[PDB]
Symmetry: D2
Subunit: 292 residues, 4 copies
């Protein structure tokens, strides 16, 4: 029952800031990077989530996230001894997934936009097959490009085409029915030796069971892979938080508004963080922010 | 009299931005790579409005005409009128009475910058009003610094309160308003406020008491940038820079909107790109004409 | 007394420059031209000529007026068309008279510790000229200056593929009265341009060209691209917040130079009450504790 | 030879949640870990024997980043500080490391930058006796410890957050001491909050007429790494300087190389390993001469 979630947070162009700090624990303004893809799983209604990372960093992810009870969710943890490809998430997470459907998001993917929740909730309601995303961009060549028909059925996915068949690119967010476990087990490793998520998606494509949800004009997919990208991403979140006033990926807020934790739960977390900005945000959340 | 017209109010400001507005009209200040006024202009164009009146001070009007010309480059018509005295936002309908004629009209403040996914559908809906007025409510966590709009679940407006200590909603009123033709006579009848201005809030309050004021909400994820402080302008520029670098499309490239609306031709776009060949903006136009693959 | 000239006339920034002069664009909280003007004032110069295009010159007049608000004097002269940087000495001949004169480009924004000391020294020249050398890792995109240990300039090349030094020449120059005649005599370029490089070469080949270095730690911002302007504004915002002092607040420079009175400052702050810039002026008159 | 200590341990929760799983001094400042900045200051002062103090949980991460120091021609030693017992505790934890040497102490979260800063550091590092602290010029000194001094640099008083400041110069976390500092630290009394305060140490030197201050005037920068907005602005500041002047701030390999502590080949080997990264390309350009 209930669709599960996996955040792939292991895995450098960011040297030396990633020499001793996991990329997905780097800050995006005022919160660790991983809070952002975690908020996406939570906004999609997922409460049973698996965190995957390296042997050095997984204990740190536990230090940050704990058992998930503070957010009314359950967090589990599994190590990925080596970065064997994105599809390896379904090998490492086989037991965790069980017979459930599952959403996979990359721990370094940061998205933001108006009317994003309705798209996530729809993707989370898939009955069978798989659902991937298509982010609209002016120059899609640096990415995996997803081509689809006028109804959302995917027809092709090409890696860095010099002649793109569409202007929609594939970010690291995927929703799957329970078939992905075995599909992942049977796919063939690349020549370089790695289980590619594209191979898993090509399989669903081949079966006419791959649909795409679009993140159109006005949606933002930030660049957390370069130093200028991270600075820009932090500046962007700071601006949005200041002008609209609400935090982006405050997991306590999402949990509370989803009814997964109580007002008293929020009050108590705020009390433990009294002299901090984050704590005052939680206190206001509990007080109601006027009309909410 | 046939099509809804538009007015961009781009006149006098206080000295809050002094000294950068001492010699540069606020609405000509840059927001990253384009003059501030391109942003609200893009909103009128996205709403389908092609007959637009630019109102500014006697000193600045010529500079706006230098920038915008007669509008033919964007497939629109620009008219210009001077606001001799800084009389208030509602004065736009007095200064613009002849331009408006018997048409419905949308007014946008020249310093208002909005952005968000699925904003066009909200604009086209507002532009389709049959009667009364349509204003906007921008969602914020702390609405106290603004005008606050209270409304029911169908968008009917109940009240508008300025800087309330006890806000009745978390939605604030920005500088974008759509009106039927009664707005001209309503503006002629409001009383100046205690601060000596013909307030747009007085116009909206008259539509409210007529039972004809509606509001369209701009929810979480939409951006209404701050162009009124130095820090706000800097943040606004950074926000535009990010969206443009990350998604690749420009925000408020008027040529782009005109072209995709069918208002100018591919040849028109190519010719503008040619006059600006060695510039970033020029290259964007060149790419637009080529199709940006499958843009 | 040494005079000063700010060249602010003159596409890459289209469309923000279509109806707004580049040098009036903001750098965080002040018009771009305030930054090079503050350099002339920190060097002690009180008689300044502003040069711009026919279209933009009135806007500079609107901003700066006669200069009395800063205890200086501003004069204005039009440049019908961008005929070259050295043309400032043609257009400015009458303004210059028989005085020594410093020329700064209206789009040049500099910032760094111990900058006033080198401005004052350059402004104290007895004869010849003084230009600057800005330390950079890749000097290829600029005019590259080579000098000896006495600060004597020996060479200047334009965008060399094999630079002879890591110091580049920004738009800031100090000259003795000889520059007018020199600018009158230099030979135009293939594009009918009166290059400032031709002028500097003349002093070079006389052994009368000295250089002041803007070393590691000094910043010369990029005001010529959209990303550069955004970065420049961010930089000024950070420094003003962290050290607390404004960069290129002309009233402050005037008041501390004794060119205007505390009352003058309070008057300006009065007119700008409720504003950030106004409160800064109020504090300046109140003393900022020890100043 | 004068030794150095970087105190990079426990912090408060002000930056929560970005410091929950990442030590504050490993957080990025644009393209390098925060600790590189104060480390660069010790190296520009000519110090090659450096002690890194941190919490038991984070010390291994600092060692992952820094190693034994040989890559920079320096020697890094590591000592634990179970809890932030006070800044002056650095001399108790580091007593054996210090031995009979003079020593410089810098806080791992202090980031300074400015034209002609090296000459100031070299002067402080050359003290014959007593102590040398710093005074950073600000328009409003009230939020800090304020240092009052005379024209030859003698310190008259240091007051914490005075409503009526005796100067516009504030005290940052950078201090140079003769060998008497260990005994002085041993004799100070714990403060009201149960901490061994560095201000107590400086006051002892002050009262003996043996405390001097070096000023960091207008044009010098002391960045704010204590708030989210401060970190964002600090990153933007480094990005600006690096893009506009071309040289990096706190590239330790560069400082080591120019000090003659490592060879051109050492730099080139590190650059080749990082050739696909911007940091690696900077090292290559430095060692291929950067023209001059
Ligand atoms: C390939 C791979 C990636 N990852 C993580 C690192 C990133 O958060 C994300 C995708 O990484 P990757 O595909 O290497 O590229 P990028 O860093 O540009 O996103 O998944 C793992 O945890 N394990 C793996 O085996
Ligand atoms: C509700 C909510 C949204 N968000 C993000 C998700 C989107 O990127 C953006 C907009 O939220 P979204 O839920 O899409 O709201 P709406 O349907 O009204 O537009 O904000 C948070 O980070 N936290 C929250 O608590
Ligand atoms: C009051 C008023 C405003 N305006 C313009 C200036 C701005 O573009 C816009 C709104 O100005 P204003 O109401 O002063 O507020 P704000 O500066 O916070 O936006 O309307 C005029 O052109 N004329 C007027 O008489
Ligand atoms: C189409 C288009 C939109 N925009 C702005 C308007 C909105 O703020 C945002 C999103 O566009 P919008 O038209 O709402 O499109 P969609 O329904 O696909 O999201 O981009 C431009 O600036 N230029 C354009 O050419
Ligand atoms: C060449 C030239 C420059 N200028 C001004 C414009 C700039 O502020 C400065 C330098 O111009 P220029 O070097 O042409 O461009 P940039 O600095 O943008 O790379 O001098 C004039 O006013 N007239 C001229 O004829
Ligand atoms: C004194 C002063 C300096 N500055 C600038 C000039 C330099 O770029 C920087 C540092 O000032 P500077 O006078 O060089 O200080 P110091 O001699 O103490 O090192 O600040 C202003 O903008 N305004 C001022 O009032
Ligand atoms: C007091 C104290 C600080 N520190 C470190 C943490 C910071 O890098 C630095 C200064 O800490 P602190 O004085 O708490 O203030 P701040 O964090 O606002 O700068 O010293 C320790 O490692 N141990 C200690 O006992
Ligand atoms: C030489 C050098 C300086 N710096 C810093 C120290 C100062 O904050 C600033 C300027 O350097 P500094 O050595 O003070 O040089 P100068 O005396 O020529 O001004 O740059 C580095 O980060 N790395 C280096 O390799
Ligand atoms: Cl894929
Ligand atoms: Cl209420
Ligand atoms: Cl209103
Ligand atoms: Cl030259
Ligand atoms: Cl102290």
């Amino acid at each position: 029952a209930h669709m599960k979630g996996i955040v792939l947070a292991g895995g450098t162009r960011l040297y030396p800031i990633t020499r001793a700090v996991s990329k997905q624990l780097l800050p995006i303004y005022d919160k660790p990077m991983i809070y952002y893809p975690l908020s996406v799983l939570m906004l999609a209604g997922i409460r049973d989530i698996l965190i995957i990372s390296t042997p050095r960093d997984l204990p740190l992810y536990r230090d940050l996230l704990g058992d998930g009870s503070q957010f009314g969710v359950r967090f589990s943890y599994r190590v990925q001894e080596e970065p064997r490809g994105i599809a390896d998430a379904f090998i490492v997470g086989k037991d965790f997934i069980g017979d459930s459907k599952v959403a996979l998001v990359l721990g370094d993917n940061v998205f933001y936009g108006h009317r994003f929740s309705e798209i996530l909730r729809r993707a989370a309601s898939l009955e069978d097959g798989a659902v991937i995303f298509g982010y609209y961009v002016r120059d899609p060549r640096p990415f995996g490009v997803v081509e689809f028909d006028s109804e959302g059925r995917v027809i092709s996915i090409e890696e860095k085409p010099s002649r793109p068949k569409s202007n929609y690119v594939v970010p690291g967010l995927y929703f799957y029915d329970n078939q992905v476990v075995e599909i992942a087990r049977r796919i063939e490793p690349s020549d370089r030796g790695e289980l590619e998520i594209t191979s898993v998606n090509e399989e669903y494509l081949r079966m006419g069971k791959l649909r795409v949800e679009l993140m159109g004009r006005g949606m933002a997919w930030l660049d957390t892979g370069t130093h200028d990208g991270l600075l820009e991403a932090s500046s962007f979140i700071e601006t949005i938080q200041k002008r609209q006033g609400f935090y982006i990926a405050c997991l306590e807020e999402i949990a509370y508004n989803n009814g997964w934790i109580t007002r008293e739960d929020v009050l108590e977390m705020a009390e433990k963080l009294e002299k901090t900005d984050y704590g005052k945000y939680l206190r206001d959340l509990a007080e109601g922010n006027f009309h909410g």
